[PDB]
Swiss-Prot record, chains A, B:
Note: The active site is a redox-active disulfide bond.
Subunit field text: Homodimer.
Organism whose genome encodes this protein: Escherichia coli (strain K12)
Known EC number: 1.8.1.9
Alphabetical list of SUPFAM superfamilies matching this protein: FAD/NAD(P)-binding domain
Intracellular or extracellular location(s): Cytoplasm
Oxidoreductase keyword on record: yes
UniProt cofactor note: Binds 1 FAD per subunit.
MF-aspect GO terms: flavin adenine dinucleotide binding; thioredoxin-disulfide reductase (NADPH) activity
Binding site for FAD: 35-42, 286-295
Protein name in UniProt: Thioredoxin reductase
Co-factor(s): FAD
Length: 316, 316
């Protein structure tokens, strides 16, 4: 096997990885970026994007990522198609083992993301990008003054339902259990919106099917209750599956400090904000952010990571 | 006078103000944005921008800001051309006095920036955007393998000279004093680059003139020493005036916690990262960031501020 050394190595080809690559390349660091299996990241799984600032019309997730790829290669970023399966971050240089070889580096930017999970239903698969969504902040404004359904039982699902009730005419929260596995302040606000307004609760229901026409989702078929096969039918314009994200950090367990699988960074207002618990290793994007989860915040921390990496590499 | 109330008010029309406006508008908050005197912010004072991610070619600062304005107005952001001169943030709703009236709001996003200072020389005025720059991270890659001059004596100037020595063939640091008003770790690294390389020091010199041709800067004329009018002439491709920034926060003194004029935010990885010392008041952009100072990091915190504001306005 081969062993390639780089001063700076970037893991991930989503908005955080690519912005860190254009800032590192314009700092004359000659960055090497490893793409992972999902070349272009999570945005290649969506259709229209209208909250990337400065792109009012006609943008899709694939088109933004094609442009980001162009930007990085313009500044001669070395892009390798490989995926990392093992890491040693306790010796110098850091050693990373991929499928096509070994990589060592003096500084590392981890931008591996936190991918959305779906239900696995064929009717859900059918309507992705045309009515089924996994991000309410992203797509909730398309369903303004319309009926919407959210499915899930954790913190994310109550958060998405709560955000959506200020946009949609009504929100239908669907869950298998007879209660939510969410935060105290979230369930207080939820029950206030249930009693004095917008959110219709649907506990002890499971999602059987996503129905729709040629243009998209028009309904959702539910079933069960506490002992009976009741079956409900709901007229809805969009479904927001909110069952959780999977931070891509199993490879870092026992190496870096994690917080529910998310990489813990230093943060703060005094610099070196993207540094993880190991000096020389930095993180950017959704892998270190479980609150905002946007392409613009991922590009912002990607930039911070490249400048923190440059300052580290120069003894500051 | 008029007194207009808004649920959410945004101050500033730079990248942070406009991104907070598109995220607030797509959250159905109907944001009101007040532009300030400098409509479009600091980026309207520069020429080519090639580190806004996903825009590899043909972008200028004015064009990005024209597009951001379009994006905000597409989502019906109410834009007011006015400037705030007095503020009361200790009573509810917050009261802000402008030149064309009074404004009250339930949540406030401050995105007023930190403007760069120049020397005030007519020859410097002449070459702005074509050889004279105030941001080395921004424009340093255009002067790769070329000679460059930085003028200033504080932390910023030593930081800019240090960053530039990895790009430029040589860096000429110019200062009036016989020493730098900078950090301990910065001056150690500076003196290492002075002795073993790239940085040529020019203490007890002042800048008399910026010379150049039709395409841009080709030189710099210096004068003085400790008792003598020596006059040096330097062949250089770019001048980086690094004498400091002015956070636009005089209006907030005694109201919010400041740190060398920069608004202190909560930061962190657990949400509500842009909140200042007052609940309901948030900050984004260069006004709260003295480390990275980029349009992409300003747009990223603009987004965080709008989502923090939305969560605040909804009792979370
Ligand atoms: C349905 C949906 C719609 C969305 N719509 C929007 C929208 O309209 N606007 C918006 O702002 N945001 C949107 N988002 C959120 C946005 O997709 C994410 O915030 C953003 O993509 C995160 O960027 P990232 O670079 O952190 O990670 P990701 O884009 O997740 O990319 C992670 C990268 O890391 C690589 N990687 C993973 N593991 C390894 C490994 N072991 N070795 C090497 N590489 C590895 C992957 O292959 C991938 O390239 C949406 C998300 C979803 C799921
Ligand atoms: C010479 C130069 C070149 C640069 N080039 C680049 C580049 O290539 N790429 C890059 O990423 N970054 C670049 N930058 C940095 C970039 O300009 C800033 O990071 C960014 O503009 C900051 O955005 P902001 O929204 O925080 O504030 P600003 O853009 O500074 O805008 C502040 C806004 O607040 C308003 N305001 C101020 N006071 C008041 C008040 N009292 N009432 C109401 N409104 C008020 C102002 O009118 C203005 O609209 C450059 C900077 C300079 C100076």
């Amino acid at each position: 096997g081969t062993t390639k050394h780089s001063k700076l190595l970037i893991l991930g080809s989503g908005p955080a990885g690519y912005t860190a690559a254009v800032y590192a390349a314009r700092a004359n660091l000659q960055p090497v970026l490893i793409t992972g299996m999902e070349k272009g990241g999570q945005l290649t799984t969506t259709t229209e994007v209208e909250n990337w600032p400065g792109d009012p019309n006609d943008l899709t997730g694939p088109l933004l990522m094609e442009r980001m790829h162009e930007h990085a290669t313009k500044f001669e970023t070395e892009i390798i198609f490989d995926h990392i399966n093992k890491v040693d971050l306790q010796n110098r240089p850091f050693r990373l083992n991929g499928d096509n070889g070994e990589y060592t580096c003096d500084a590392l930017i981890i931008a591996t993301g936190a991918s959305a999970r779906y239900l696995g239903l064929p009717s859900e698969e059918a309507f992705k990008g045309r009515g089924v969504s996994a991000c309410a902040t992203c797509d909730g404004f398309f369903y303004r003054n319309q009926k919407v359904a959210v499915i899930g039982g954790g913190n994310t699902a109550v958060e998405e339902a709560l955000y959506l009730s200020n946009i949609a005419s009504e929100v239908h929260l669907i869950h298998r259990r007879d209660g939510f596995r969410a935060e105290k302040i979230l369930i207080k606000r939820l029950m206030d919106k249930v009693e004095n307004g917008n959110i219709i609760l649907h506990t002890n229901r499971t999602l059987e099917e996503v129905t729709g026409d040629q243009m998209g989702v028009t309904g959702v078929r539910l079933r069960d209750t506490q002992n009976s096969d009741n079956i409900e039918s709901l007229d809805v314009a969009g479904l927001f599956v909110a069952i959780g994200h999977s931070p891509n950090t199993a490879i870092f367990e026992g190496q870096l400090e994690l917080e529910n699988g998310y990489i813990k960074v230093q943060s703060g207002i005094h610099g070196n904000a993207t540094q993880t618990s190991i000096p020389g290793v930095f993180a950017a994007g959704d892998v270190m952010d479980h609150i905002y989860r946007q392409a613009i915040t991922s590009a912002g921390t990607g930039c911070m990571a490249a400048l923190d990496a440059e300052r580290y590499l120069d003894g500051l």
